[model samples]
Every structure is written in C-alpha cells, then in structure tokens.
Target chain A: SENPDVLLSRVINVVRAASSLASQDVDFYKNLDRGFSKDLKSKADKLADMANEIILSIDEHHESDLWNNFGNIMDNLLEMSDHSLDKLNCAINSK
Target chain B: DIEKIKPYVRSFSKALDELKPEIEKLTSKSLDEQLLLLSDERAKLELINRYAYVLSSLMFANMKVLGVKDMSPILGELKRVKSYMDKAKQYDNRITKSNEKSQAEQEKAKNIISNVLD
Candidate 1:
C-alpha cells in the first residue's frame, strides 16, 4: 500500500501551490494584460494537471479509511482549483 | 477591463492572506507527517476540516467579488467536504471500539494459557 502520509503531503503541496498563485499580487496579473498572455492560463492548467495526479493516485490505492479520506480531500481540492481556473480565465480574457 | 478587475484580485489576495496562519499550518510537510504518524484518524480529519473551512471561505470570497448570483455550487462543495469528514470520524470510532474488544479478549486468552502451564 502507498504511504498515506506521503500522499497527503503531495496533495497539500500541490493545492498550496495553486492557492499561492491564485492569490498572487494583482499587479503581477496586471502585467500579463497585454497580448493574450499564457502566464495565468498556463498556471491554471498546471493546477488542473497536479490536481488530477493526486486524485488518480488516490483511486489507484485500495479501499481504506485513509485513502477514502484522501479521495474526498482531493475532490474538494480539485473543485476549488477549478473555481480558481474559472476566475483566471475571466481575468485573462477581460483584457 | 483588466484595470477594473484588478481591485477584485487584490481583494481576493487579501482574503487569502487572512487565512495564512491556518493555510501555512495545513500545508507544512513536517506538520503533515506529524499528524499522519503520531495522530489518530479523527485528529487528521479535524485538521482537514479546518482546511476545508479555509477553502470554502476563499470560494465564497471570490464569488462575492464576482457578484455571483447563485452560491449553490460553493455551498454544495462545502457540504460535501464536511459530510466526508463526519463519515470518516464515525468509521474511525467504530474501528477503535472493535480493536479494544479484540485486545481485551486476546489478553484474557493469554492469561488463561499461562495459568494452565503453571
């Protein structure tokens, strides 16, 4: 069985990265206003990828209480990441 | 247009910052390992419950700035996360009780065997 502790650390690190970028200074995003900038979009896509990786890892493991909790935790993290992506999309397209 | 949205972005950043104490604690690798190894399942779920609350607050704050008409999506997500936490705790409680019973029975069996040998 995969180490539950390591897997959780992975989830936390990825989700934390997403949140960090999502909350970056507005001026940082402001700089990307010119020309359809891929900075924000690329970051959002990376978040999606990382979130998928965590979820897939969780599903691959057998049914256990820890894995079950990890599944739910990853689900919420992914949903929150999706919401951040939507906001990033709107922010990027507005210019 | 970007200028118009900049304020919202700044506001959202501040909102996340307000949760920095909790967020940092949750994301720390040392703390993550500490809880997983040293703590029980219920303790872990409780910590995650706090993380969920912060995430939920971030979503709501983002939605508020956007003037989102329907909050069902955010609300539903929060409810779902909470339900899982509650269920996990309940399951942990059941397992703990079962383990205690098994331990007691095993101890009694061991004592009886030792007495017979003596």
Candidate 2:
C-alpha cells in the first residue's frame, strides 16, 4: 500500500515534470515567441522548484500536519497546472 | 502525428463523458460531507496524483502539437498563474514563520518550568 506521503510526493514530482516540459517548450519556441516566453519559463521554473522543496520537506518530516497542508497545496497546484497548460495550448494554437 | 493521437483523443472524450454522472453526484454533496471526503486515502490519491498524471499527459500532448506566435496572451495567463503560486508561497511562509515563533515560545516556557521545578 502506498502511504499518503508517497502519494503526495509522486503528485508533486509529476507536477514538476509537467513544468519541466513547459520550460523546454518555451525554450524551443523562444525565437518564434520572444518577449513572454522568458517570463513564462521563469514562472515554470519556480513552480518546479516549489514542487521539489515540498517533496523534500515531506520526506524529512512525514508528519500528518505537513501531509494535510501539502495535500491542499498540491490540489490547487494540480488545478493550476491543468489550467495553465490549457491556456498555453490556446495561445500556441491560437484556436 | 494527428492520426496517431486520434484514438487517445476519443478515449479521453469518452472517459470524461462517463465521468460526468459521478461528478454530478459529487457536486451534489453537502458542504460538510464534501470536506470530509478529503480525509479518505482514495480521495487524496484520486484528486491529487491522478490529476497530476492527467496534466502531465495533457502537457506532453501540448508539446507535440506546439508552435507559437503572438504570445502576449500566453504570458498574461502565465502571470495570472504565477500570481496564484505567489499567494500560496506567501501563505506557506506565514505558517512556517508562525511555527518557528511558537517553537521558540515553547522552548522558553519549558526552560522556565525546568528552573522552577529544579
């Protein structure tokens, strides 16, 4: 059985991976879309870093309070990740 | 590439269609019951990691179909998302600082108790 802590860590890692791909795509399109891509990449990088920080803290503590707090945070982050990607897709495809 | 993804696209649409009734049922839940649902392990996994994987694949698909121009709107939406992340970070910082203060006060009280008892 997977612990809640492990579940939460996996979630954060997945979010971070999504952000990582976003960062790469931004870089790949930098010449085509210059001005905002840099800022977008920066934001994506921060999101990735935050995920990593949360995972480390979870691993170190494994406390129930930490689990609950980070669980709520990850919930919101997941929603944001989905929304952000949808928005980016719209902007990219202009559809 | 487009042809290759058509099958998965159908799958995604069909799965979401199937999920609508379940979603409707959950949405009808009372507020207290809804909050209590978060306490379950399956609920946590379903809401968090499961959605995380969904977003991951969504992003991957976005990448495969990507090229961009006139990116101001993209950046604008990203800023909105960044603002949200900032808000969460701010709250986390406040709670972390509050915990530090509480621990310090706890230590000070413990020292006073030890001196008096000794």
Candidate 3:
C-alpha cells in the first residue's frame, strides 16, 4: 500500500525546494516576489471589475433582494484581496 | 492604545518565529516522524490562530477607540491573517488525512496476520 506520507512529503518537498531556490538566488527570488505582487494587484483589479458588473446587473433588473447579499459578498471578496495584497507587500519588504 | 496593541503583535510574531525550527525539522523527518511532527504542528497552528485572532481584534478595537472610521487597514490585516490561517488549515488537513490513511493500512495489515502465521 502506498503511504499517504508520500503526499505530505510532496508538500514538504515543494516548500523546501521553493525555499532553497529562493536562498540560492535571492535577487531572482526578489524579482519573482515583485512579479507576484504585481499579479496580486491584477487579481484585485479583476475582482473589482466583476463586482462592478454585478452591481450594474442589479441596478438594471432590481430582481431579487438576494442581489444585495451577493453584491455584498463580492465587495467583501475585493476587500479580502486588498488586505491580502497589503500583507504580501509587508512580507516582501521583510524578505 | 497603540502601545498596548504592540505587545500582542510582538507576541504573535514571536510565536511564529519559535515554530520555524520545528516546522523545518518536521519537513525533514521520516514518514512516521513526519506524522508525529505534524500532530505537533497542528497544535502549534491552532495556538497561532488563537494568537492572531486576539491580536487582530485588539488592533481593530484600538482603531475604534481612536475614532478611526477607515477600517481598511484593519480589514487588510485581518485578510492577511486569514490567508495564513487558510494555508495552515490546508497543511493540517493533508497531514490528518495521511494519518488516517496510514492507520487504515495498519488495520488492513493486521487482517493478514493470520495468513502470515500459517
């Protein structure tokens, strides 16, 4: 029987490998971190765009009360991503 | 108020730092050792989660006490901590499942004990 430890080992390996890679080329890792930071910004923007679409859809139809709740969730998601990006910036700076 | 909040934040950061060496060891251990280490890790993660929650809440409360209506900063910090917690949770789940699967395999092997005895 295959050990489930195999799967856990994979996760451990990925983290160790990533850390080693970062240590070997701190400059490259720094650049990659910045790139990921930019990507996070784009993700936040996309979330905002989608939220706007949802709001517009609600405005046009005024269909159900559920629309407000859905809109709120989307807003929260955007806020969450914004917060995540802030944390990411802090982490990168520390690095 | 900011000064008061500083301790909690510092403590939380310190707790995270203390766990780093254990986490490194856990990653490098053998399969069985990893299983044991993961149990310890899950406990540590839970403690970290509790500390994070307390620190985050106190920070938000301090902001309110200061009459700051801009919740952006607090919300952002909360989101970041939540993301970290999510990662920790995923790690815990993976290890827990591994433990369960290994236990099952052990049970299965026990069933074949009689055959081996023959």
Candidate 4:
C-alpha cells in the first residue's frame, strides 16, 4: 500500500515546476540555456537511450547537475500533466 | 504496463479515501480517458496525481535524488503549489455544503407535499 500524501507531493513538485516556467525565463536558468543549447534538442524522450545516458552520468561533486537533469526530466514531464489538466477542464465543462 | 501500474494506483486512491469516490468515478474509463477526465476545482491537484501515477510507471524505481538547492524557485513553486492545492480543497467543501442544502430543501419540499395531502 502507498500513502497518498507522499505520492501527491511528488506530483505537485512536478506540476509546480511546469507552471513556474510559464512566463519568466530570464532569471537563473538563462545561463543554462546556452549550456543546454546543443543541436536545438528538446524534451527528454522518456524511453530514449539519451535519457538513460543522462541518468548514468552524474557524480556527487556536481550533484547540482543531478537536480538539473531531474529538472529537465520534470520540465518535460509537466507538459503531459498540463495537457491532462486542460483536457479534464474541457470535459467537465462540456455537459 | 498499464496493468502493472494499475495495482499501485489502487492503493493511492484508497489511501486518499477522501478523494476515493472521485477516483472510482473516473476509474471505469479507459486509461487515457480516465486521465483526461479526472479533475475538479482541484484541477492541478488531479493533474499532478495522474502525473505521479504515470511517472511512477516510467521512472520512480530508478529515480535518484541527490542534490537540490533549497532556494530554487522551482522548489519554492512546488511548495506553494502544495498549499495552493490545499486551498483548492475549499472548492470541494463548498460543493458538499451546497449538496447538503439541496438535500434539505428536497426534504422540506417533500414534507410540504405530504402536509398538503394530509
């Protein structure tokens, strides 16, 4: 059995990441843009080998990079949740 | 994969028994439609819950959490979202109150009808 409080916390953290990215991007991670800017690559492909690579490459010293990857994974993850919420909002309003 | 994940999801819906009816209400739909159908004023609330359900299927077992800055805005926003959703609970409270009132009004109407005939 799983605890809802615990799992729901995970979802909120992921959704919050998505919402905060909505308007402002000129702050902290702008510097990250160039670093992340190779090949115009976008969202992490969940089942992609590249994702597995990102997962494999972090060390404790630059553990910030780990969160960075988590951020990347989550940043993309939010799109799905956002779409999910959008559709839900649309459905109940239908009839 | 959906079948494997379904088992884990039941416990989540049950553990949050307060949201249980809502969960069951949507459960009969096909997986994607159920995901699409889930919501209330707590829109982000269910959005995120389903995200966790999917993410767990995708990565939870292998997720490695190491370093995170406390001041990070994403973290701050995530914290605030939790409270924001908690506040959204007020929307549900309002509906429950409304329903009870509706029920009482119905009872009173029924009594009036009986009195008229009696």
Interface RMSD, all models, one decimal each?
12.4, 14.7, 19.1, 15.3
Question: Stretches of candidate 4 above 4 Å error?
Answer: A1-66, A72-95, B1-77, B115-118
Query: What is the lDDT for A30 in model 1?
Result: 43
Best of the candidates, lDDT: 1
Task: Please give the lDDT score at residue A51 for candidate 1.
Answer: 32
- Tens digits of lDDT, candidate 2, B1-118: 3244334334433433343343233334332343346654334423433333333322322222233334454344335545554544554475588689999999999999999999
**Candidate 1 structure quality by residue, lDDT tens digits, B1-118:** 4465545444434433443444444444433444448444445455545455444444444433333467686668667766755655565576688789999999999999999999
Off-target runs (Cα >4 Å) in candidate 3 are A1-95, B1-49, B114-118
Per-model TM against the reference: 0.40, 0.33, 0.33, 0.35
Candidate 2, DockQ score (0 to 1): 0.04
| Candidate 3 docking band | incorrect
List candidate 2 segments past 4 Å from native.
A1-95, B1-36, B39-64
Docking class of 2: incorrect
- Cα lDDT tens digits for candidate 3, B1-49: 3244334334333433343443344324222332345444445445434
lDDT of 2 by residue, A1-95 (tens): 14355533443444344334443434444565575455445434433333334344323443535335444545565564455444433543563
Model 4 clash pairs are none
Q: What share of the true interface contacts does candidate 1 keep?
A: 0.00
Q: Score the docking of each candidate (DockQ).
A: 0.04, 0.04, 0.02, 0.05
Worst-scoring 10-residue span by lDDT in model 2 chain B? B56-65
Candidate 1 segments whose C-alpha is farther than 4 A from its true place: A1-3, A32-37, A49-95, B1-79
Evaluate chain B of model 1: give its TM-score.
Answer: 0.46
Residue B79 displacement in candidate 2 (angstroms):
2.2
